Homo-oligomer: A and B are copies of this chain.
Amino acid sequence: PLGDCLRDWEDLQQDFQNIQETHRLYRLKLEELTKLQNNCTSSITRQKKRLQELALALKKCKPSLPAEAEGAAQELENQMKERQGLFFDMEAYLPKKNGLYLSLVLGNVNVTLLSKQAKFAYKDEYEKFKLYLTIILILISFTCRFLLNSRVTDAAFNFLLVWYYCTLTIRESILINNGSRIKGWWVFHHYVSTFLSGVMLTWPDGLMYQKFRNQFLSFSMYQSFVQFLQYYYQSGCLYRLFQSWMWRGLTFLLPFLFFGHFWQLFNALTLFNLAQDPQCKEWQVLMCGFPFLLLFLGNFFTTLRVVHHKFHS
């Protein structure tokens, strides 16, 4: 028929012109928003730069004799520090340039959430993803280790591990760009773990490979488990957002982390001893011996430093 469909088409035309009017409207608003945003970011970067120059100059002029009321200078210094903090939390609400690593993978993209709700929801989704992939990883590890599939599934498991670590690197860099305090060591931890898994992947079937696959699968399984536990603790802590229960839980969780660290060290040691005895594949055995050692070293060092920093309270 024609009449019913034509009349519905007319109603559609009305709603069409309405939507078109509104969409044509907000183009100008979007333009003005981008303009003002650009102006604001340029200005704040300029002012922060000049403020830092003032800070350096005054710090150099600072150590002079305190015979005068230089306590006022200390107050001015507190003021500079709080100004830096204000500029910081203000600019966190404003989009930034990627940096180096993200520019290499994505490049010239304005990946910067601009709402506390959206930012927090994204971080929560990130942790949930880490948990789910940890479950998948532990089930594949259990299948490969005990269920007697020692032919290929180790290759697939290693592919999964390397993809996991690369995508966690990317999400970690996005989180750093959006703002967090994880810029210390872990972004390199993920790199070195990726390298270790790759080297272990190149490793072709010899004989010692059996002993080492046994140790390595068992340890990776245990680390996946402790990863699950750490996720649950940190998700409980975020849902809390108290302090006493948090500190008690961290004290309960620290021994497992130290046990994992020293397991890493013992694995590296048995790897050295194995590479000492007559055995080919020295390339792979030694270039997979180095990581475990370095990874343990950095991990234990950072954990000791952070627990001392916390207890310093």
Interface positions of A (Cβ within 8 A of B): 1-2, 5-6, 8-9, 12, 15-16, 19-20, 22-23, 26-27, 29-30, 32-34, 36-37, 39-40, 43-44, 47, 50-51, 54, 57-58, 61, 72-73, 76, 79, 83, 90, 93-94, 105-111, 113-115, 118, 121-122, 125-126, 129, 152, 155, 159, 166-167, 170-171, 174, 198, 201-202, 204-205, 283
Contacts and interface: CB of A to CB of B under 8 A. Distances in A.
Contact of A202 (B58, B115, B155): B155
Contacts of A32: 29
Contacts of A159: 198
A30 B114 contact: yes
Contacts of A109: 111, 113, 122, 174
Nearest to A58: B5
Contacts of A15: 43, 47
B47 A1 contact: no
A29 B39 CA distance: 15
Contacts of A43: 15, 19, 22
A249 B265 CA distance: 61
Contacts of A36: 22, 26, 29
Contacts of A155: 202
Contacts of A58: 5
